[PDB]
Amino acid sequence: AGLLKKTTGLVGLAVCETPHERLKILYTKILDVLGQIPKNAAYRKYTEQITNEKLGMVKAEPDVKKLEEQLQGGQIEEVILQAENELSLARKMLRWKPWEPLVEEPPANQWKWPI
């Protein structure tokens, strides 16, 4: 990383001097949480796809500056912030269980909007 960047530019979060292992551990944790999620759910498929892709690129390229470039998520700090948010989302809707069919249909004409 050479000279560690002083500030990411956003005052809501600081610099992670060792970002690669953070990406690794958070990605592995969320992959575990998706392993919890049943196979048939489309959420597990999509999120496992994007996360295993992200883990592949982060473990492939070890330069942080190129890591942001091919990660298209700005500075690595907001990337691990978004990874924490994704972990949180998967955990929170583990028991929300949205993979089930719709709870019930809307009542009669509840969406037509010429009145």
Partner 1 sequence: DTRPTIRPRNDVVHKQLSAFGQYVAEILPKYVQQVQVSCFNELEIFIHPDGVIPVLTFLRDHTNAQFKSLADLTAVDVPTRQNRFEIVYNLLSLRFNSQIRVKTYTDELTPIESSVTVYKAANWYEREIWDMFGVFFANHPDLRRILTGYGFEGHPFRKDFPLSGYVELRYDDEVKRVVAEPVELAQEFRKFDLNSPWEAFPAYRQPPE
Local structure of residue 13 (DSSP, 8 states): S
Say how far apart CA 68 and CA 76 lie, in whole Å.
6
Nearest-approach distance from CB 4 to partner 1, in angstroms: 24
Q: Which is nearer to partner 1, 2 or 106 (CB)?
A: 106
| Interface with partner 1 (CB under 8 A) | 42-43, 46-47, 50-51, 72-74, 82-83, 85-86, 88-89, 92-93, 96-111, 114-115
Nearest-approach distance from CB 5 to partner 1, in angstroms: 20
20 HSE (CA, 13 A, CB side): 13
Q: Which is nearer to partner 1, 1 or 55 (CB)?
A: 55
CA 90 to chain centre: 9
